[PDB]
């Protein structure tokens, strides 16, 4: 848990889980479903996350949807092969600019960041940082809110 410079807790909310590990991804989605999440989507890579966000934001804009964000929250694994969660987040932020919106993106990491990771967390534009156990998931979302 921290900000970056229960069965109805998340009812009404749609979430994307980005995790390159099939087992922890399923653990994350199960936890979210149990907290009442109305829709959980999951993907296994930064490039897939970017695609889902890019397409969702266009689709909502073209439809004039009430909610313009396709996901109310995104739980992004920091370390993944190919496009890691820093780079995916930076690209998401660039895509969001022409919509005037900002998705809450929570960096999910198995260890405290060092200096270089901490810097990348801020520069990519993540909103919070959360341990891989997800035990502080609810406290972090209320901090964001």
From Swiss-Prot:
Q: Which domain of life is it from?
A: Eukaryota
UniProt domain Response regulatory: residue ranges: 14-145
Q: Where in the cell is it found?
A: Cell membrane
Tissue specificity is: Expressed in vascular tissues of inflorescence stems and floral organs, especially in procambium cells, and in siliques.
Phenotypic consequence of gene deletion: Cannot be transmitted through the female germ line. Impaired megagametogenesis visible from the four-nucleate stage, with two normal nuclei and two degenerated nuclei, leading to female sterility. Normal response to cytokinins.
Query: At which residues is 4-aspartylphosphate found?
Result: 77
Report the protein's function.
Essential protein. Functions as a histidine kinase and transmits the stress signal to a downstream MAPK cascade. This protein undergoes an ATP-dependent autophosphorylation at a conserved histidine residue in the kinase core, and a phosphoryl group is then transferred to a conserved aspartate residue in the receiver domain. Required for the development of megagametophyte in female gametophyte (embryo sac) independently of cytokinin.
How does the record describe its quaternary structure? Homodimer. Interacts with AHP2 and AHP3.
The protein here is known as: Histidine kinase CKI1
Instruction: State which stretch of the full-length protein is shown.
Output: 979 to 1118 of 1122
């Amino acid at each position: 848990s921290g900000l970056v410079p229960d069965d109805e807790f998340l009812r009404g909310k749609r979430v994307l889980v980005v995790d390159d590990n099939f087992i922890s991804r399923k653990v994350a989605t199960g936890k979210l479903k149990k907290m009442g999440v109305s829709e959980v989507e999951q993907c296994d890579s930064g490039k897939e996350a970017l695609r889902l966000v890019t397409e969702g934001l266009t689709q909502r804009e073209e439809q004039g949807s009430v909610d313009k964000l396709p996901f109310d929250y995104i739980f992004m694994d920091c370390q993944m092969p190919e496009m890691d969660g820093y780079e995916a987040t930076r690209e998401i932020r660039k895509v969001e600019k022409s919509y005037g919106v900002r998705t809450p993106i929570i960096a999910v990491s198995g260890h405290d960041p060092g200096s270089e990771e901490a810097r990348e967390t801020i520069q990519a534009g993540m909103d919070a940082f959360l341990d891989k156990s997800l035990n502080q998931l609810a406290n972090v979302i209320r901090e964001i809110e």
